[PDB]
């Protein structure tokens, strides 16, 4: 529920964002609720490139 919900922006494993590598919105509090590739807590790994072998 809202009001008193959102405290994971320091030492926690954030959940990967619904876009994973294509996120488009960007807020100061969204980075704390969803993780992204390139962060020490990213953990989505939903087949985005696969060892760069798409030829
Ligand atoms: Zn995001």
Curated annotation (Swiss-Prot):
A zinc finger (PBZ-type) spans 15-36. Residues 44-54 are annotated as: Flexible linker. A glycoprotein binds at residues 14, 19, 24-25. It is found in: Nucleus; Chromosome; Cytoplasm, Cytosol. Changing residue 14 to A: Abolishes poly(ADP-ribose)-binding and poly-ADP-ribosylation by PARP1. Does not affect histone chaperone activity. It comes from the Eukaryota. Poly-ADP-ribosylated. In addition to binding non covalently poly-ADP-ribose via its PBZ-type zinc fingers, the protein is also covalently poly-ADP-ribosylated by PARP1. The PBZ-type zinc fingers (also named CYR) mediate non-covalent poly-ADP-ribose-binding. Specifically recognizes branched poly-ADP-ribose chains generated by PARP2. Poly-ADP-ribose-binding is dependent on the presence of zinc and promotes its recruitment to DNA damage sites. The KBM (Ku-binding motif) mediates interaction with XRCC5/Ku80 and XRCC6/Ku70 and recruitment to DNA damage sites. Belongs to the APLF family. Interacts with LIG4. Interacts with PARP1. Interacts with XRCC4. Interacts (via KBM motif) with XRCC5 and XRCC6; promoting recruitment to DNA damage sites. Interacts with XRCC1. Interacts (via C-terminal disordered region) with histones; interacts with histone H2A, H2B and H3-H4. Histone chaperone involved in single-strand and double-strand DNA break repair. Recruited to sites of DNA damage through interaction with branched poly-ADP-ribose chains, a polymeric post-translational modification synthesized transiently at sites of chromosomal damage to accelerate DNA strand break repair reactions. Following recruitment to DNA damage sites, acts as a histone chaperone that mediates histone eviction during DNA repair and promotes recruitment of histone variant MACROH2A1. This is Aprataxin and PNK-like factor. It comes from Homo sapiens. The gene is APLF.
């Amino acid at each position: 529920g809202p009001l008193g919900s959102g405290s994971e922006g320091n030492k926690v494993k954030r959940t990967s964002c619904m876009y994973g590598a294509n996120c488009y919105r960007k807020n100061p509090v969204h980075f704390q609720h969803f993780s992204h590739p390139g962060d020490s807590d990213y953990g989505g790994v939903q087949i985005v490139g696969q060892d760069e072998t798409d030829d």
